Design an enzyme around this catalytic site. Structure first.
Site, PDB file in Angstrom:
ATOM      1  N   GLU A  35      42.212  28.067  35.302  1.00 30.01           N
ATOM      2  CA  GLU A  35      42.474  28.863  36.510  1.00 30.01           C
ATOM      3  C   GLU A  35      42.141  28.034  37.761  1.00 30.01           C
ATOM      4  O   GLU A  35      42.894  27.845  38.744  1.00 30.01           O
ATOM      5  CB  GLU A  35      42.181  30.164  36.872  1.00 30.01           C
ATOM      6  N   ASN A  46      51.814  31.861  45.580  1.00 34.50           N
ATOM      7  CA  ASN A  46      52.765  32.031  44.480  1.00 34.50           C
ATOM      8  C   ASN A  46      54.096  32.210  45.151  1.00 34.50           C
ATOM      9  O   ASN A  46      54.204  32.445  46.505  1.00 34.50           O
ATOM     10  CB  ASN A  46      52.311  33.431  43.908  1.00 34.50           C
ATOM     11  N   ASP A  48      56.111  34.479  45.250  1.00 35.10           N
ATOM     12  CA  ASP A  48      56.694  35.815  45.842  1.00 35.10           C
ATOM     13  C   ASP A  48      55.955  36.208  47.065  1.00 35.10           C
ATOM     14  O   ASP A  48      55.795  37.104  47.923  1.00 35.10           O
ATOM     15  CB  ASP A  48      56.322  37.138  45.008  1.00 35.10           C
ATOM     16  N   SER A  50      52.697  35.983  47.391  1.00 32.79           N
ATOM     17  CA  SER A  50      51.054  36.264  47.215  1.00 32.79           C
ATOM     18  C   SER A  50      50.334  35.386  47.022  1.00 32.79           C
ATOM     19  O   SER A  50      50.765  34.224  46.805  1.00 32.79           O
ATOM     20  CB  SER A  50      51.014  37.249  46.040  1.00 32.79           C
ATOM     21  N   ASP A  52      46.603  33.414  45.014  1.00 30.65           N
ATOM     22  CA  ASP A  52      45.661  33.581  43.858  1.00 30.65           C
ATOM     23  C   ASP A  52      44.177  33.005  44.381  1.00 30.65           C
ATOM     24  O   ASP A  52      44.435  32.075  45.154  1.00 30.65           O
ATOM     25  CB  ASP A  52      45.717  32.796  42.691  1.00 30.65           C
ATOM     26  N   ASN A  59      44.837  37.661  42.186  1.00 35.44           N
ATOM     27  CA  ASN A  59      46.166  37.763  42.927  1.00 35.44           C
ATOM     28  C   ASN A  59      45.989  38.982  43.822  1.00 35.44           C
ATOM     29  O   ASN A  59      45.764  40.053  43.486  1.00 35.44           O
ATOM     30  CB  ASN A  59      47.494  37.956  41.962  1.00 35.44           C
TER      31      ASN A  59
HETATM   32 RU   LIG Z   1      48.657  33.152  39.406  1.00 37.00          RU
END
Ligand SMILES: [Ru+3]
Ligand SMILES: [Cl-]
Ligand SMILES: [Cl-]
Ligand code: NA
Ligand SMILES: [Ru+3]
Ligand SMILES: [Ru+3]
Ligand SMILES: [Ru+3]
EC number: 3.2.1.17
Length: 129
Positions: A35, A46, A48, A50, A52, A59
């Site tokens: 990650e 991201n 959309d 959003s 992380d 998120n």
């Molecule tokens: Ru992600």
């Protein structure tokens, strides 16, 4: 902060993730590796809109507030910035909520695709725990 592998394994254990919801420590260390490359300050936007945040790339669509993810929730009741701290408390406490949410560690796409089913114990091999 960029953690060492064994350093992070030990911190995650101290913060109660070893076998949390049945996930052995190596699952959490593997997930963090892929990650964030063990970097608490990792962020990734991201498609959309959003973002992380932190060592487990939690998120903003669901879990934390960043003030710039319209329509989102803050189920961990934290600012997303809390997830970037050198102290992993916020990330760990939020991850416990996420992993209890029904899909377990499949919530982390990198875990599903790169850790699930693999010899995750190797991620803690050699560490003093
Ligand atoms: Ru992600
Ligand atoms: Cl928001
Ligand atoms: Cl599960
Ligand atoms: Na949010
Ligand atoms: Ru153990
Ligand atoms: Ru700590
Ligand atoms: Ru092995």
């Amino acid at each position: 902060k960029v953690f060492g592998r064994c350093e992070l394994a030990a911190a995650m254990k101290r913060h109660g993730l070893d076998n949390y919801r049945g996930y052995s420590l190596g699952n959490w260390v593997c997930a963090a590796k892929f990650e964030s490359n063990f970097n608490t300050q990792a962020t990734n936007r991201n498609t959309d809109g959003s973002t992380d945040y932190g060592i487990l790339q939690i998120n903003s669509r669901w879990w934390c507030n960043d003030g710039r993810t319209p329509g989102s929730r803050n189920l961990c009741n934290i600012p997303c910035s809390a997830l970037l701290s050198s102290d992993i408390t916020a990330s760990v406490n939020c991850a416990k909520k996420i992993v209890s949410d029904g899909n377990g560690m499949n919530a982390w796409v990198a875990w599903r695709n790169r850790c699930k089913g693999t010899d995750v114990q190797a991620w803690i091999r050699g560490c003093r725990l």
